[PDB]
Amino acid sequence: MRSSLAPGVWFFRAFSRDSWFRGLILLLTFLIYACYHMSRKPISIVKSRLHQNCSEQIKPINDTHSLNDTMWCSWAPFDKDNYKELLGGVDNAFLIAYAIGMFISGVFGERLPLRYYLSAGMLLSGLFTSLFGLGYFWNIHELWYFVVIQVCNGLVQTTGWPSVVTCVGNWFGKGKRGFIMGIWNSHTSVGNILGSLIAGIWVNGQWGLSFIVPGIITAVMGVITFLFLIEHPEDVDCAPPQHHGCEEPAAISFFGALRIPGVVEFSLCLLFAKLVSYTFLYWLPLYIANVAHFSAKEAGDLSTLFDVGGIIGGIVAGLVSDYTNGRATTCCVMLILAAPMMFLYNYIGQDGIASSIVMLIICGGLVNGPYALITTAVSADLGTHKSLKGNAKALSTVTAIIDGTGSIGAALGPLLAGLISPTGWNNVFYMLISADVLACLLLCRLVYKEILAWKVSLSRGSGYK
Amino acid sequence: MRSSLAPGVWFFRAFSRDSWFRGLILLLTFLIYACYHMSRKPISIVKSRLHQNCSEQIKPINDTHSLNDTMWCSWAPFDKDNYKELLGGVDNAFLIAYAIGMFISGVFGERLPLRYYLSAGMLLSGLFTSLFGLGYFWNIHELWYFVVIQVCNGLVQTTGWPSVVTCVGNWFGKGKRGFIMGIWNSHTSVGNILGSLIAGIWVNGQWGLSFIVPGIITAVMGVITFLFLIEHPEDVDCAPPQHHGCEEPAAISFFGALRIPGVVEFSLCLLFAKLVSYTFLYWLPLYIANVAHFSAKEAGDLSTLFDVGGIIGGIVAGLVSDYTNGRATTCCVMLILAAPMMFLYNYIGQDGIASSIVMLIICGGLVNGPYALITTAVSADLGTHKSLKGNAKALSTVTAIIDGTGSIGAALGPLLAGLISPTGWNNVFYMLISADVLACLLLCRLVYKEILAWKVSLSRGSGYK
């Protein structure tokens, strides 16, 4: 009667139909790739329980029998002195088989329909984590069952990341890409926290129901992504995106995607940054133990503040790389200006709580900014490069190459950290410094290119059409 | 690529724009009137705690001092022997002032803009329950504070029900009204359960935070109803409803709404059904105590199964009243066939658990079916009667009359149940039987009318235009 329109409906009216499905696809492929990081965690928490020093344990009525072993308490293929030398046998049977699958199970994303290929992966990840969980209810005590699962569970969870920036690549253009897909990259830090929290419930008590419940959540999300994944903007008659600058294009060959002018240098740079991010997080508890004399209940908060700094860095490196028309030169500067900050953290870390946090957030925002910006912005940019000439299709091969060359370094992390550990606890830091200096060396051709690319438009004095 | 549209989007495409805002307004005015039943409960749970027999209580170091009173344990204006005779002084200071407000604070719904009138009530209900809750944090121990709140809290929570079937009246026609607004009437049973569950948390411990949290939830919902309540279908240019069978109409007078041909008989029938529904629920624990010798932990489930039977009855009486073109003749039959079922429950109740539930669900579905169908179907029907001739507006005066004449009987429930209780515990049952026989007597004119209304169309042999 005597009212105009309520301000909520007058606010939601202004967003046109263009900006509604483009807001749908972010909210959908945010949960789709958050469930993978939810279902990847719980081998990290159950790493602590499966071996216990049960000379300090309640109920010694399980036949100690003149000081025998830890058979009655710990799990039986992880009971003896090789528990540290077999857990590494388990997890390396994932990180290897995930970095071989990423080069191949992105190539199938070029050919198959994308929605079926995504749902037939999210209905198998939640089956294979669950079949890892089916050891407690059947009392399986052989080591060979617990490694042929995490191999077959490492060919399935490939299918996320080549088929998540394939959906987002088909809708968005060269608008504010580094900012949208920088805010959007909060899933790799909102997945870890919910993984550590949900799998933290059933740790002690009975541990079989710490894997099966994320394996149910992932396969439940695997059919909401079956019922609602609109791939192309023309299938529901929206507007097609910008120019990223008849017959539908068929495919691309794998070797034909290597000749794109950025895909080699933007991958053997990124292998030397995931290795830095693993080396630092492996090094930091061994640093704060023997020097800082610091409470270990807050180091778990430190290893979360590092990824919160990563969230901040994934947007700070995005805005600047948008408004300066160059993205390799942002990553090179934020890698060069990172090593004095980590050297200063090594020199100044003697404070307990106060000066540590502010020196740790900055080190979190300078080695996970340029890890984000090369796998969420230029990976959706080199795939839409002008040299494809429109008569091809390559967005799930460039992403596949960049992420597989990323995860090979994550596989070679523990294969080197345990090699220089007995020869000193400080060689790790020098390997970190060498890898971070070498990281801003592969980009040198692209930095040399983009300096001239700036100076062309500068020396013309606003050169235009 | 090689996929058609996903079945979720192909399912949601078929519902046109007509059936989207009409699905919005149910989901909105379901929560709007669920929050009132959420914020009406917690005087029921704290009725038990404020008086305690603390001769059976831990910590007697609060100066018993040669067997003194219950001063140290119970609350101070509810400590002596008159605790039963003052709690009734509190709650009757609500149910009276709610049944005087309903005749007047629906009439303001005719004049004011509806969205502002609803939000200025839901931002005061959550203030007045909260100011009832501000006694624990200030240690208020006078009886007169705890009755001038529940009077002023009983003029505010009037504004729900005349302004909830005013929104739903403007959208829906004579379609499947008795079925939609019968499924929709599940809020008066989904509110009670969440009220008993949320207020059940902070009972013992500290009880001040059992009122303030529902008073925060209601005033938070009071602005979501500010931002999103589209009243008329023409304000967002939808289709106007059916014919319920220029200048916008101004108003109606209060005495002018009484001359509608149903509004008198459909209210002094309903006062004699809420009284039946209160008398039965007051009578049933006194029945199962002295005869059945039954566990009192399941009587709380019995008093919920009665309202679940009410949910079933509110739909079973709706379908039949739609497909027989007569609604008073459904209520009369379901009231006449109710008293033999309650008499049979009185004669057969000696079983412990087995035969009691099936005889209680039926008694739940025959005295809360015809309480729903007269306040959610014919109240949105007599207001849209043909005798208004289109040049008036009366939907928040017919609802006001029917619900106020309903709640006067709920006020006269406890004003009579405590009057025949000392003269026997079985006079309550005879008062129930007398009221239920008298309930199907006020409808007799309308039953006599609708029998002829059927026989006109019957004796013509498919008489039509």
Provide DSSP, A139-203: T---TTHHHHHHHHTTTTTTSSGGGTTTHHHHH--SSSHHHHHHHGGGHHHHHHHHHHHHTTTTS
What is the least distance, in Å, from the CA of A396 to any CA of chain B? 14
Residue A114 contacts B, CB cutoff 8 Å: yes
- Amino acid residing at A132: F
Residue A235 contacts B, CB cutoff 8 Å: yes
Residue B235 contacts A, CB cutoff 8 Å: yes
Comma-separated ranges of CATH 1.20.1250.20 domains in chain A: 21-46+81-245, 257-455
Tell me whether residues B116 and A8 touch, CB distance under 8 A: no
Q: What is the CATH code for B246-465?
A: 1.20.1250.20
Nearest CA to B370 out of B315, B411, B441, B424 is that of B315
Q: What three-state secondary structure class fits A74?
A: coil
CB atoms near residue A462 (< 10 Å): 6
Name B291's Cβ contacts closer than 8 Å, sequence gap at least 6. B349, B350
Nearest CA to A352 out of A290, A292, A285, A291 is that of A292
Q: What is the CATH code for B18-44+81-243?
A: 1.20.1250.20
CB B28 within 8 A of CB B152: no
DSSP state of B288: I
Rounded to 10 deg, the angle between the A212-227 and A187-198 helix axes is 140
How far is A395 from A61, CA to CA, in rounded Å?
Answer: 61
Look up residue B35 and give its two tokens. 């929050």
Q: What three-state secondary structure class fits B313?
A: helix
If you measure CA to CA, which chain B residue comes closest to A228?
Answer: B8
How far is B231 from A407, CA to CA, in rounded Å?
Answer: 56
Site of tokens 């059409």: A465
How far is A238 from B362, CA to CA, in rounded Å?
Answer: 54
How far is A307 from A284, CA to CA, in rounded Å?
Answer: 14
Name B458's Cβ contacts closer than 8 Å, sequence gap at least 6. none
Comma-separated ranges of CATH 1.20.1250.20 domains in chain B: 18-44+81-243, 246-465
If you measure CA to CA, which chain B residue comes closest to A4?
Answer: B235
Judging by beta carbons within 10 Å of its beta carbon (0-12, 13-18, 19+), is residue A303 exposed, middle or buried?
middle
Q: How many residues make up chain B in this entry?
A: 465
How far is B314 from B301, CA to CA, in rounded Å?
Answer: 20
Look up residue B57 and give its two tokens. 């209580």
Site of tokens 């972010």: A26
What is the least distance, in Å, from the CA of A297 to any CA of chain B? 30
How far is B393 from B250, CA to CA, in rounded Å?
Answer: 7
Residue B12 contacts A, CB cutoff 8 Å: no
How far is B436 from B455, CA to CA, in rounded Å?
Answer: 28
Residue B118 CB-half CA count within 13 A? 31
Q: What is the CATH code for A21-46+81-245?
A: 1.20.1250.20
Q: Which CATH superfamily is domain A257-455 in?
A: MFS general substrate transporter like domains (1.20.1250.20)
Site of tokens 């501000």: B134
DSSP state of B427: H
Long-range Cβ pairs for the range B422-431 (8 Å, 24+) = B425/B286, B425/B290, B428/B279, B428/B282, B428/B283, B428/B286, B429/B283, B429/B346, B431/B279
How far is A92 from A411, CA to CA, in rounded Å?
Answer: 7
- Amino acid residing at B359: M
Rounded to 10 deg, the angle between the A271-287 and A398-412 helix axes is 30
Look up residue B262 and give its two tokens. 């149903």
What is the least distance, in Å, from the CA of A211 to any CA of chain B? 29
Residue B448 contacts A, CB cutoff 8 Å: no
Rounded to 10 deg, the angle between the A354-364 and A299-322 helix axes is 40
First-to-last alpha carbon distance for chain B, in angstroms, is 56
**Cβ contacts of A114 on chain B, cutoff 8 Å:** 1, 3
How far is B163 from B264, CA to CA, in rounded Å?
Answer: 21
- Amino acid residing at B430: Y
Nearest CA to B356 out of B366, B344, B368, B367 is that of B344
CB A70 within 8 A of CB A123: no
Name the percent of chain A in helix, strand, coil, to the closest 5. 60, 0, 40
Q: Which stretches of B244-309 are assigned E, i.e. beta strand?
A: none
CB B198 within 8 A of CB B109: no
Tell me whether residues A3 and B248 touch, CB distance under 8 A: no
